[PDB]
From a paper:
Dominantly inherited mutations in MAPT, the microtubule-associated protein tau gene, give rise to cases of FTD and parkinsonism linked to chromosome 17. Here, we used cryo-electron microscopy to determine the structures of tau filaments from the brains of human MAPT mutants V337M and R406W. Both amino acid substitutions gave rise to tau filaments with the Alzheimer fold, which consisted of paired helical filaments in all V337M and R406W cases and of straight filaments in two V337M cases. V337 lies inside the ordered core of the Alzheimer fold, whereas R406 lies outside it.
Paired helical filaments (PHFs) and straight filaments (SFs) were found in cases 1 and 3, while only PHFs were in evidence in case 2. The structures of V337M SFs and AD SFs, which comprise two asymmetrically packed protofilaments A and B with the Alzheimer tau fold, had also similar cross-sections perpendicular to the helical axis. However, unlike SFs of AD, the backbone traces of the protofilaments differed from each other along the helical axis in V337M SFs. In protofilament A, strand β4 of the Alzheimer fold, which comprises residues 336–341, was shifted along the helical axis by about 3 Å compared to protofilament B, which adopted a typical Alzheimer fold. Because β4 contains the V337M substitution site, this shift may have resulted from the presence of the mutant residue. It, thus, appears that, like SFs, whose interface contains a nonproteinaceous density between K317 and K321 from both protofilaments, TF assembly may also require external cofactors. Small variations among the observed structures of filaments with the V337M substitution revealed the presence of an adaptable region around the mutation site that explains the accommodation of the mutant methionine without disruption of the overall fold.
Residue numbers in the entry:
A (entry chain A), B (entry chain B): 304 to 380
The structure:
């Protein structure tokens, strides 16, 4: 009782950008005073906890192009 | 009395060709016979003078794509 399998994907994709100018970008957030206090905190298993976070990000990619792929092949008997 | 100038050209142009085949070209001009006559001849100040010319050209560029640009910025006070 034979079994043949042929997983032949083919991918010739493009993910592209041209851009003449990226320019004159400004990021002036005013100051936010923040105060953080606790008695007790418990984080038992697999926790992701952002708490009392002040963040300024200025992410300015000339490209910033992403591609993801995920080939899975699972055989079971 | 200030003067600013900012000459920021940006050029992302393309000038392009694909071609599958050029293929069979023939250039069989028959015979050419000609006469030019004068007594006396002079030239001055950068004269550019083709005379009595028999020419055969077979110019076959696989891609004959041309680009010219000319940025000029000219200040006087």
């Amino acid at each position: 009782g034979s079994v043949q399998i042929v997983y032949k994907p083919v991918d010739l994709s493009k993910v592209t950008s041209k851009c003449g100018s990226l320019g004159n970008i400004h990021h002036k957030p005013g100051g936010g005073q923040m105060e953080v206090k606790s008695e007790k905190l418990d984080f038992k298993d697999r926790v992701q906890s952002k708490i009392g976070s002040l963040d300024n990000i200025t992410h300015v990619p000339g490209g910033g192009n992403k591609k993801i792929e995920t080939h899975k092949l699972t055989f079971r008997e």
